Structures are given as structure tokens and as C-alpha cells.
């Protein structure tokens, strides 16, 4: 996957998984598959549902353990955009970067959040890169609108 799943995300998937597994009586249909992807904040397309349901229903033959489930659904959860997430959760994400709660993400606050997300330290040069990429109003910090875009296509 693009990056490692956070503990809160593993719990989101665990919850999706219980729903998936209750629903699954041998096989899984698209209404069900779709709904428990929604349980984890992701709106699938019917194309996606057909692919996924065929994988689950033919290849694994209905035997999906949590590990299988995370291989399939992991990427989708990581791929959620701003408009699926909702405001309160975006707010929360932002919070987590804005450790001092002053409504602005400082370049060292970015550094820590990036370290925690990617699971390794990020270079001085790279973090400077990110800011210039991200800051619309050219004040060297990251605010909420700025941060939302960072997760918007
Ligand atoms: Ca801050
Ligand atoms: Ca800014």
C-alpha cells in the first residue's frame, strides 16, 4: 500500500470486517460489499464492487480472513478523499498535525506528522519542498483549507 495503516485505521477495517463477515453467507453480494466499505468511509463504484466481489467470491472462494480483507480494503481506505471523509474527521486529522492547536501547521509540526505517517524521519529538504507545494498564501505555515487540499484531487 501507499503507506502503513494507522491503529485507528486498523480499527476502522476491523469494524468493516465484522459487518462483511456477518453478511457473508458463503458468498457476498454487491449491496453488502458496498455497504461495509461505507462503514469505513469509502464510496465505491459499481465497477469496483464487481471486481471486488468476483475476487472474494471466486478466487478466495468466500474464505477471507482479516489479512486478506486488509489487502483488499486497505488501499481503498487510504484512497479516501476529503469529500468521503466528512468535515468533523478532516477537522480531527488536522488536529493531529496541529499539535499545539493554534490552527496552523508549523514546519516542525509537519515534520512530526509526516514521520508518524510514513513511519520514518523525513529530510529537511523534503519538508521544505512540501510547504512550497502546499501553501497557497505564501506564509510558510499550513492552515485547514491548505491541508484539506493536500488530501483533495
Ligand atoms: Ca500548530
Ligand atoms: Ca498557509
From Swiss-Prot:
UniProtKB keywords: Calcium, Cell membrane, Cytoplasm, Cytoskeleton, Golgi apparatus, Lipoprotein, Magnesium, Membrane, Metal-binding, Myristate, Phosphoprotein, Repeat, Sensory transduction, Synapse, Vision
Protein's recorded name: Calcium-binding protein 1
Purpose of the protein: Modulates calcium-dependent activity of inositol 1,4,5-triphosphate receptors (ITPRs). Inhibits agonist-induced intracellular calcium signaling. Enhances inactivation and does not support calcium-dependent facilitation of voltage-dependent P/Q-type calcium channels. Causes calcium-dependent facilitation and inhibits inactivation of L-type calcium channels by binding to the same sites as calmodulin in the C-terminal domain of CACNA1C, but has an opposite effect on channel function. Suppresses the calcium-dependent inactivation of CACNA1D. Inhibits TRPC5 channels.
Gene Ontology biological process terms, A to Z: negative regulation of protein import into nucleus; visual perception
Residues the record lists as binding Ca(2+) 2: 98, 100, 102, 104, 109, 136, 140, 143
GO MF annotation terms: calcium channel regulator activity; calcium ion binding; calcium-dependent protein binding; enzyme inhibitor activity; nuclear localization sequence binding
Positions with a binding annotation for Ca(2+) 1: 21, 23, 25, 27, 32
Domain EF-hand: 8-43, 62-79, 85-120, 122-153
Part of the whole protein covered: 219 to 370 of 370
Effect of residue 106 to A: Loss of phosphorylation and loss of calcium release by InsP(3)
Origin species: Homo sapiens (Human)
Subunit structure: Homodimer; when bound to calcium or magnesium. Interacts (via C-terminus) with ITPR1, ITPR2 and ITPR3. This binding is calcium dependent and the interaction correlates with calcium concentration. An additional calcium-independent interaction with the N-terminus of ITPR1 results in a decreased InsP(3) binding to the receptor. Interacts with CACNA1A (via C-terminal CDB motif) in the pre- and postsynaptic membranes. Interacts with CACNA1C (via C-terminal C and IQ motifs).
Amino acids binding Mg(2+): 21, 23, 25, 27
Free-text tissue specificity from the UniProt record: Retina and brain. Somatodendritic compartment of neurons. Calbrain was found exclusively in brain where it is abundant in the hippocampus, habenular area in the epithalamus and in the cerebellum.
Entry domain remark: EF-1 binds magnesium constitutively under physiological conditions, EF-3 and EF-4 bind calcium cooperatively and EF-2 binds neither calcium nor magnesium.
One Gene Ontology cellular component annotation held by this UniProt entry: plasma membrane
PTM annotation, UniProt: Phosphorylated. The phosphorylation regulates the activity.
Residues recorded with modification Phosphoserine: 106
Coiled-coil residue windows: none
Subcellular location field: Cytoplasm, Cytoskeleton; Cytoplasm, Perinuclear region; Cell membrane; Golgi apparatus
Result when mutating residue 135 to A: Loss of binding to ITPRs
Effect seen on changing residue 25 to A: Loss of magnesium-binding
Annotated residues for binding of Ca(2+) 3: 135, 137, 139, 141, 146
